[PDB]
Design a binder for this molecule. Sequence first.
Ligand SMILES: *[C@@H]1O[C@H](CO)[C@@H](O)[C@H](O)[C@H]1NC(C)=O
Lengths: 211, 219, 208
Amino acid sequence: DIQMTQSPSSLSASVGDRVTITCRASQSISSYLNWYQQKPGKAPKLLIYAASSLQSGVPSRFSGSGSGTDFTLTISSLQPEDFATYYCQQSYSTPPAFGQGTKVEIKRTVAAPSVFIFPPSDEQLKSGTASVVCLLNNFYPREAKVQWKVDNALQSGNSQESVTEQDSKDSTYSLSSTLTLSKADYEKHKVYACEVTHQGLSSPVTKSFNR
Amino acid sequence: QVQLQESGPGLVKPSETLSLTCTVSGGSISSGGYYWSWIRQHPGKGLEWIGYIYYSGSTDYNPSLKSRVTISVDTSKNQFSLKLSSVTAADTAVYYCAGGSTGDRHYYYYGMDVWGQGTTVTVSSASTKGPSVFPLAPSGGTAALGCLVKDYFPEPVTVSWNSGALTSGVHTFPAVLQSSGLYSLSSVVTVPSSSLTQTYICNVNHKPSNTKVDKRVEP
Amino acid sequence: RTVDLGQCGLLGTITGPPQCDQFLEFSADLIIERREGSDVCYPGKFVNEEALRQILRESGGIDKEAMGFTYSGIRTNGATSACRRSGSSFYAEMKWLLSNTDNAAFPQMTKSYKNTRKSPALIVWGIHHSVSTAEQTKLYGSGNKLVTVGSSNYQQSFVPSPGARPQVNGLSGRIDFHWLMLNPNDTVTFSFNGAFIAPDRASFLRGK
Ligand SMILES: *[C@@H]1O[C@H](CO)[C@@H](O)[C@H](O)[C@H]1NC(C)=O
């Protein structure tokens, strides 16, 4: 069977940059090489078939080239909405084969997060647990440190965080950090605070509430 | 104008058999204008081809799965289906149905030009559990609101805000498996703080548990 | 594409000492900083300088936008022989606000700027630590000085600390600079009664 070797696994590029993604087949596939775009959570979308024919509606900044073994997908002027994982697929022979995929990230300038904090709901307390949620909204780059403080006691281990995929319009990230306590520990204390470190912040930012 | 839609359970016990169906609309399934396909995607992995089925009912399978895969077509229902036996947690994946226009320059000339939405299948012995939804409510010009969607199984849930009216500035976070075996996630939206007089409703849906809940938010 | 900053220190492109006049809105992918570069004219520094330099290195330069501050009851044209433009001058992107006449009362004031662009605004301001209590009174009137700076992210206070430092560029006080990244549609608010070096223009980072 015919294997596809796709490269690179990941790339970041600025809006307007030219991006090239390559695939190599283990033997000639003539021109039967297809490119797909998969935005996170969504089904793949066919961009190019037969190495170089654009699907109807696909913007002309996408182009494909190659024949035989070596093929290339070019994005001539990378746009924020082009964040995605891109796949090649040979359809010369059965079984078909997909490349391993290339994740394309957008490079952009620094943006500090806007920070918000949310107390547990009265309904969740009735049930017997408490979730405190710290939100970091629309920042870049992705790296960030979030720490909890309750009565100025530093917490650890009782919290987990989740990060969105890069936004399709401004290329920022958003992050949630959730601190979980039993109804017991939560009532024990008054002041709940979230402290955020990030490259866009000269010094850390703290949000808090009184229970 | 061919369109595809997966259906089937999102939960399958280990050693049991996974069954999914793809309903084709906008065209006949055995016309010979398309070949049909199942493809899956493991969390954080690439696309893996499961097999083809052709307008004649003949099939081609991925040789690594051929022992336990069956693809079939029901022309009366305009559907094609997948059956995968003896599943393990390795078979947890998003499952896609797709089709490819048949060509005369080459039978597979056009790639897979039509795709289903994908449906998530978790292989687990744990039971289905519906979520609990709690509000997230409270700094100058803009405010943040949300819903906490806690303790559900399996994936996925979906969240819209005001039935899909409000769309910009909404972030629904990737679910996180907690140290209890249940998932949890928040969905948040940022809105002008002068509107706190306007109504914000998260619409939470958990299809494997037949659960739908709406919820309002205010401090 | 490159820019050779020469005498201009990278952070000086934000504040604008005379050696940076030609780089106030520079645009370049590679930034050549020279050992002879200086950020300042009146002596002082950014208090968190390397972090901001790293930010600007990953930019494609800066674009400048007026912040629209106007003032009444004070002077906005404070000038120093340390910032020479064929005569005494000041940082191009800043205003040295002074009492209307020497020793006069400097009234309590608030200024606010909302970022109406789609990108974050780099906001810089300075605190002036005068060479002496006597000098602080001549420039800003007698009494304690207080500068507060607020946004949706921050709330900090600055109190000057007058006293004689070693003469640098001919002067014994210090003007130190502070920075924040103001998010789209957020508003930064300054409140002050003297010893405040106010921004005239904000900076917006160019894509690299
Ligand atoms: C900021 O506010 C203006 C004025 O209401 C609006 O047009 C713009 O879309 C807003 N931008 C963001 C990022 O909220």
